Write a protein that binds this ligand. Structure first.
Ligand SMILES: Nc1ncnc2c1ncn2[C@@H]1O[C@H](COP(=O)(O)OP(=O)(O)O)[C@@H](O)[C@H]1O
Ligand SMILES: Nc1ncnc2c1ncn2[C@@H]1O[C@H](COP(=O)(O)OP(=O)(O)O)[C@@H](O)[C@H]1O
Ligand SMILES: Nc1ncnc2c1ncn2[C@@H]1O[C@H](COP(=O)(O)OP(=O)(O)O)[C@@H](O)[C@H]1O
Ligand SMILES: Nc1ncnc2c1ncn2[C@@H]1O[C@H](COP(=O)(O)OP(=O)(O)O)[C@@H](O)[C@H]1O
Ligand SMILES: Nc1ncnc2c1ncn2[C@@H]1O[C@H](COP(=O)(O)OP(=O)(O)O)[C@@H](O)[C@H]1O
Lengths: 308, 217, 78, 51, 131, 348, 133
């Protein structure tokens, strides 16, 4: 772990059994002779911590059955893919602009895993110690391997994987081997025990054109910035967890369909309630709905008459 | 009891102070620097981060108090025993300490010509709060902040700079524009904040930034 | 059209012949040094990229290796 | 060498310096810096940009 | 070819960046821990100041030699050296705008007695326009 | 001759017994309380197997605990609490200048609104799930410059109880790689420790996005720092006690990811003084300077609009300047009138 | 690891020993240790003990679930581990060289596992069962 690999001699008492090519194994101080293999010490299993349901996700149905289809179903029904013929897709790449269904769908996947949903945000793969990170992220991968079935969730990859690197001064001499051996690590698991690498990122316009190639991902899930037949369901959910006094209308503000996330639906509806806290009201009737919506109901754009 | 005056003193000068003052002679020759990062209390004791990029815990030892130990200062340490011997006042590079012009006055206010309301305006705006602030405070108004001089291609800007800094009787620093932008992320930023830290430590001082077009896009 | 014969015909007849299949599609992490590798392999096949939709992208390197390839240790086929 | 990439070293009698060709990593300069033997070729350059 | 006896009295020495003086002063090896050290035996206290660089040994980590500053990429620029063979009798066809150029470039020569004589400081810059 | 040396000399015998001490390296126990031996991670160091104190409290040695280790023998010593950086030069100190809402002029809607959104979830949190919604987290103080941004949080700094983490966003970033992300996870974990807390990151265009394609060293180092700051503003919780607010010029260069309601919900547009707020600023910075009686504020406010609070204290500063080189008693009406008409010369 | 020593602070100025005692020409010969051995000069450590102390220092479980559920267990790994032993003897019969690629450090370990399994039950499914009789 002190920098380099270097040659050794291993003793006879240890068996040549557990020495996998990423097996963390101990060495001797001042000698560096191998002594004993170790349990996979490394990241957290995330025991029951994140909590949004898959029932209050709102609207998202086709993406919910695609991620339900390609992540937790091949971990449970692992052999039906070995009764039809089509393989489980290895990774899941989620590109969402500007972000609607990223991290409550990857949060409500984490309830009914019955599987080691290990999280890691993809930004501490770089560390101040040089040559540290690749060893770190392969500790992450094997920490999902000996805990199978597991779901590796690594966010915002474009932190560690971009199209454009720099051969000189080594700010990115190591992040071109964060991505490189991780790119070699995911190819080392085609024997298919159970490890699924789902991953999300706000934008995939500059992700990398070698991060997919049917083996490292095999998938791509568009998140839609929803419209008419979905927007109604988002309002139905978010209003269904509030106090309403039916002076509100639903489809009036489903109408004017103009460029909303789900996050700003939570902002105009949350803002509707908080604007009802002014008169110390336990409900919301007419203006706080319309009121907050207009205030921040997209604080407008910039039309442009003549053309149009 | 009259034998107890200074004879038991000097055996502890020789033992206690040959040893203790021997490592206090090692305050100079092998001595090391560090930055303490916190100071906590166990039933004091600190965590220093020595500048070979590693950090050690230690019970805090003599010649440094719990009051003259601020988290983030520049405090030295031994190079084998790793106990903080004495403090050092806070530091930075010489790229900011290169701005220490002493050879200022040879361009007086007589060599500048034809701009005398700008001399009255600038010199009133700068060295009058250096010699008459209290009278100024008796009016009860805030001292004016930095003065931006500007002109077409080349008038009397820098000549009013070292002409005003000529007869100021303060300390002064000739900070350029493109000294502040370098290839690293940290250096450009670190050195302006430590430039104003120098000016605060050595205050009262005025600062000339020549050619803001460097940091002006 | 996008699909239908790319990256797969040039793959298949590269490996019926057991030639090699070097792809310089993309320049992410590392021109002229690749020629040495191809020369060492003795026989080789270099493949390219096709992006317009699913200014001087890879026609630059294209010719850049047809300039060295025109006068040229001979059984390399871009 | 791996951490810091250069040195010029020797080779033991039973190594026959004639076959040991470039980009075929193996070393042993244990302390004085002198070779012993050879190891797994360790996949040359293109093996890299293919895999 | 016989410098074996003198190599042991050389003390291979590490350059470090000097800073403040309290005596004591702080060096900075740019790979080590920028630490406190005094002068050896013979170097003057007015010979070593801030900013400059001095050499530090590796045994008891102490300074012996003050060292010149670094110019790493502009070493090749310098003042060329030797210099090409064309001269004033070669570049012909102008005859006066040499003499404007000549009197500015050639005042470390004879010329400074004229300029400290009749109180001139010479121009510093010269600009050379042409198609 | 004896009590003096006894007290102020024998008290200084402590240098030898403290001089005997040796110091202890620190590290983080990657847990695996392998019973008799644990595997810890040193700071710049390798992971390795360490023996234990033998009567240590092993049962609370949690994975991710700062622990002190011996140097020579290297057995683990007395544990440590979770560290803090010079975030002490962040939390423990900022710019709270007993400035109050009295000095804030003419934006009572914005400061009552910011005060209610920021500390009113900390006064009465029970009224929000009563209505049926969690309170919002962030506000983005976008506006033209001057205008009371940095200060506004000065007035918030000197009127609240929790540790107001007031930081400039460009003293964050350092030359070492992966360092700024260490600083921002240290900041938000420090916010997890002391609650409820307020984190003030002004001027944030240093960490402000509209992420690029090509500078590749000086920008992608921060466009992965904004990934850690962004994925801890978001997190997998909602941070549930701490509320950060950010104040900047140029909101039209910020990242869309950091603007999506959630990271910053109620974006506040602080605006230039209209006429009423103009006379408010004029009275407040015209307060402690000595005055006239029937000094015509209304023609000053009527005269030329489009100023800022900074420009109106520039007006009173220039008029006091006029008296201070002109040697009068306070000002006159023609000194404010000569003051505005030189500030009105100061356009772009 | 036990060793006493001397006062050879000074006096660099007899004991035939049968040729310098043996095992201090074999210490862990390390320079700071051997430089310490200039002053140290360890000699021996003898030992005594008595017979008393020496001497001093020197069932069932049947079908609870026990006998079944450790011969219901291990015979299943004899089934499919003997299937992998079939795959081992079929595979390594031909195209085998260099000590089976160094004993398959990877995918450890076929065959021996079977031997271990065989050993486990025959010390258990007889012996205390024997004492049942
Ligand atoms: N389809 C949806 N249904 C219900 N709530 C949503 C939906 N999309 C987004 N939200 C809400 O808006 C916020 C923004 O989520 P999002 O930006 O998609 O997260 P991320 O950027 O991590 O994918 C979330 O806190 C979530 O509660
Ligand atoms: N009013 C002036 N009085 C004296 N010298 C002047 C004046 N205006 C220009 N100069 C000359 O110009 C030079 C300084 O130019 P300066 O105005 O400093 O250019 P810049 O403003 O771009 O620095 C000096 O050599 C000085 O003699
Ligand atoms: N005639 C074909 N035979 C087999 N596969 C084909 C054929 N045409 C297209 N494909 C499919 O296209 C994929 C290969 O991509 P490719 O055709 O190289 O992309 P492009 O169309 O951009 O060249 C394979 O997965 C393959 O199944
Ligand atoms: N008066 C002259 N006498 C001799 N050669 C001349 C004269 N004027 C121009 N030249 C020729 O022009 C060339 C100098 O090129 P130069 O003026 O440096 O081009 P550029 O201005 O593009 O650098 C020389 O070969 C030189 O002989
Ligand atoms: N409403 C106001 N009342 C008083 N001062 C103000 C007001 N608005 C802006 N200012 C001025 O702005 C300064 C604080 O800086 P600020 O306006 O926040 O700029 P920035 O937003 O760049 O920090 C104060 O010193 C104050 O004089």
């Amino acid at each position: 772990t002190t920098g380099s690999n270097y040659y050794v001699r291993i003793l006879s008492t240890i068996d040549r059994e557990l020495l996998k090519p990423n097996a963390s194994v101990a060495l001797h101080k001042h000698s560096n002779a191998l002594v004993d293999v170790l349990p996979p010490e490394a990241m957290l299993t995330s025991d029951q911590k994140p909590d949004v349901m898959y029932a209050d996700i709102g609207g998202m149905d086709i993406q919910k059955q695609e991620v339900r289809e390609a992540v937790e179903l091949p971990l449970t029904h692992f052999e039906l893919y070995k009764q039809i013929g089509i393989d489980p897709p290895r990774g899941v790449l989620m590109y969402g602009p500007p972000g609607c269904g990223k991290t409550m769908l990857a949060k409500a996947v984490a309830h009914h895993t019955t599987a080691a949903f290990i999280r890691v945000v993809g930004s501490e793969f770089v560390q101040k110690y040089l040559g540290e990170g690749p060893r770190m992220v392969r500790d992450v991968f094997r920490l999902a391997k000996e805990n199978a079935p597991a779901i590796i969730f690594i966010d915002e990859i474009d932190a560690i994987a971009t199209k454009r690197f720099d051969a000189q001064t080594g700010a990115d001499r190591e992040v071109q081997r964060i991505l490189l051996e991780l790119l070699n690590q995911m190819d080392g698991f085609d024997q298919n025990v159970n490890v699924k690498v789902i991953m999300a990122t706000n934008r995939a316009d500059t992700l990398d054109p070698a991060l997919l190639r049917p083996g490292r991902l095999d998938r791509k899930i568009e998140f839609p910035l929803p419209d008419r037949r979905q927007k109604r369901l988002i309002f139905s959910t978010i209003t269904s967890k509030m106090n309403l006094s039916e002076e509100v209308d639903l489809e009036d503000y489903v109408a004017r369909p103009d460029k909303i996330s789900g996050a700003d639906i939570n902002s105009i509806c949350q803002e509707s309630g908080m604007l009802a806290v002014r008169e110390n009201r336990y409900i919301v009737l007419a203006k706080d709905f319309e009121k907050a919506y207009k205030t921040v109901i997209k604080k407008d754009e910039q039309e442009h008459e003549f053309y149009k | 009891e009259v034998l107890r005056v200074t004879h038991e003193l000097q055996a502890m000068k020789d033992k206690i102070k040959e040893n203790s003052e021997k490592i206090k002679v090692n305050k100079t020759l092998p001595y090391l620097v560090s930055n303490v990062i916190e100071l906590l209390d166990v039933d004091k004791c600190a965590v220093i981060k020595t500048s070979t990029r590693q950090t050690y815990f230690l019970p805090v030892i003599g010649l440094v108090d719990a009051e003259k130990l601020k988290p983030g200062d520049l405090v030295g340490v031994n190079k084998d025993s790793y106990l903080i011997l004495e403090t050092l006042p806070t530091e930075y590079d010489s790229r900011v300490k290169a701005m220490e012009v002493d050879e200022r006055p040879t361009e007086q206010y007589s060599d500048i010509g034809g701009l005398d309301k700008q001399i009255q305006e600038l010199v009133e705006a700068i060295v009058l709060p250096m010699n008459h602030k209290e009278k100024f405070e008796n009016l009860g108004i805030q001292p004016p902040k930095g003065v931006l001089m500007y002109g077409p291609p080349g008038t009397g800007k820098t000549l009013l700079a070292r002409a005003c800094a000529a007869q100021t009787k303060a300390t002064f620093l000739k900070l350029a524009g493109p000294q502040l932008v370098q290839m690293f992320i940290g250096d450009g930023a670190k050195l302006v904040r430590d430039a104003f830290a120098l000016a605060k430590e050595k205050a009262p001082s005025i600062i000339f930034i020549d050619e803001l077009d460097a940091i002006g896009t | 059209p996008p699909g239908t014969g790319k990256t797969l015909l040039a793959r298949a007849v590269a490996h019926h012949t057991d030639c090699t299949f070097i792809r310089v599609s993309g320049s992410e992490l590392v021109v002229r040094e690749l020629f040495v590798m191809a020369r060492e392999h003795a026989p080789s096949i270099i493949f390219m990229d096709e992006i317009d939709s699913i200014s001087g992208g890879d026609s630059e390197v294209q010719r850049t290796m047809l300039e060295l390839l025109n006068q040229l240790t001979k059984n390399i086929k871009v | 060498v791996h951490p810091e990439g250069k040195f010029v070293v020797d080779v033991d009698k039973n190594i026959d310096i004639n076959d040991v060709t470039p980009n075929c990593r193996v070393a042993l300069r244990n302390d004085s810096y002198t070779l012993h033997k050879i190891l797994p070729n360790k996949v040359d350059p293109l093996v890299s940009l293919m895999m | 070819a016989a410098d074996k006896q003198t190599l042991q009295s050389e003390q291979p020495l590490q350059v470090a960046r000097c800073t403040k003086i309290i005596p004591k002063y702080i060096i900075n090896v740019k790979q080590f821990a920028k630490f406190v050290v005094d002068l050896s035996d013979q170097v003057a206290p007015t010979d070593i100041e801030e900013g400059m660089r001095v050499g530090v040994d590796r045994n008891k980590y102490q300074i012996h030699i003050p060292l010149p500053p670094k110019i790493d990429p502009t070493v090749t620029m310098m003042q060329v050296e030797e210099k090409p063979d064309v001269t004033y009798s070669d570049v012909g066809g102008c005859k006066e705008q040499i003499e404007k150029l000549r009197e500015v470039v050639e005042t470390p020569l004879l010329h400074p007695e004229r300029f400290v004589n009749l109180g001139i400081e010479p121009p510093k810059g010269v600009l050379l326009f042409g198609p | 001759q004896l009590k003096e040396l006894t007290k102020q000399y024998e008290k200084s015998e402590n240098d030898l017994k403290a001089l005997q001490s040796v110091g202890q390296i620190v590290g983080e126990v990657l847990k695996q309380l392998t019973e008799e031996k644990f595997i810890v991670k040193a700071t710049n160091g390798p992971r390795y197997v360490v023996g234990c104190r033998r009567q240590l409290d092993k049962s609370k040695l949690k994975p991710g605990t700062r622990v002190a280790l011996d140097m020579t023998t290297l057995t683990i010593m007395r544990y440590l609490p979770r560290e803090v950086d010079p975030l002490v030069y962040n939390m423990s100190h900022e710019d709270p200048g007993n400035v109050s809402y009295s000095e804030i002029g003419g934006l009572s809607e914005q400061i009552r609104e910011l005060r209610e959104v920021i500390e009113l979830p900390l006064t009465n949190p029970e009224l929000f799930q009563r209505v049926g919604i969690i309170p919002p987290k962030g506000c983005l103080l976008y506006g033209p410059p001057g205008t009371g941004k940095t200060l506004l949080a000065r007035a918030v700094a000197s009127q609240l109880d929790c540790n107001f983490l007031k930081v400039v966003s460009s003293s964050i970033v350092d030359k070492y790689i992966g360092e700024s992300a260490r600083l921002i996870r240290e900041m938000f974990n420090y916010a997890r420790d002391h609650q409820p807390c307020i984190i003030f990151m002004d001027e944030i265009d240093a960490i402000g996005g509209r992420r690029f394609s090509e500078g590749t060293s000086a920008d992608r180092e921060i466009q992965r720092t904004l990934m850690e700051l962004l994925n801890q503003m978001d997190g997998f919780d909602t941070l549930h006690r701490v509320k950060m607010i950010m104040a900047t010029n140029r909101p039209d260069t910020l990242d869309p990811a950091l603007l999506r309601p959630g990271r910053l919900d109620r974006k506040i547009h602080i605006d230039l003084p209209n006429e009423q707020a103009r006379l408010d600023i004029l009275k407040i910075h015209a307060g402690p300077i000595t005055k006239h009686g029937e000094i015509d504020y209304e023609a000053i406010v009527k005269l030329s609009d489009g100023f800022n609070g900074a420009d109106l204290r520039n007006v009173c500063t220039e008029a006091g300047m006029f008296a201070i080189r002109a040697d009068h008693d306070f000002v006159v009406q023609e000194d404010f009138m000569k003051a505005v008409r030189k500030v009105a010369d100061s356009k772009k | 690891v036990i060793d006493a020593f001397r006062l050879i602070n000074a006096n660099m100025m007899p004991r035939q020993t049968t040729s310098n005692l043996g095992h201090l020409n074999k210490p862990s010969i390390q320079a700071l240790i051997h430089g310490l051995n200039r002053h140290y000069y360890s000699i021996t450590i003898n030992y005594r003990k008595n017979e008393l102390e020496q001497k001093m220092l020197l069932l069932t479980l049947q079908d609870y679930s026990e006998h079944c559920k450790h011969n219901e267990s291990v015979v299943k790994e004899m089934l499919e581990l003997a299937k992998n032993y079939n795959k081992a003897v079929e595979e390594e019969d031909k195209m085998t060289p260099e000590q089976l690629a160094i004993k398959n450090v990877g995918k450890q370990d076929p065959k021996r596992h079977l031997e271990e399994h065989v050993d486990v039950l025959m010390t258990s499914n007889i012996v205390q069962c024997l004492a049942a009789m």
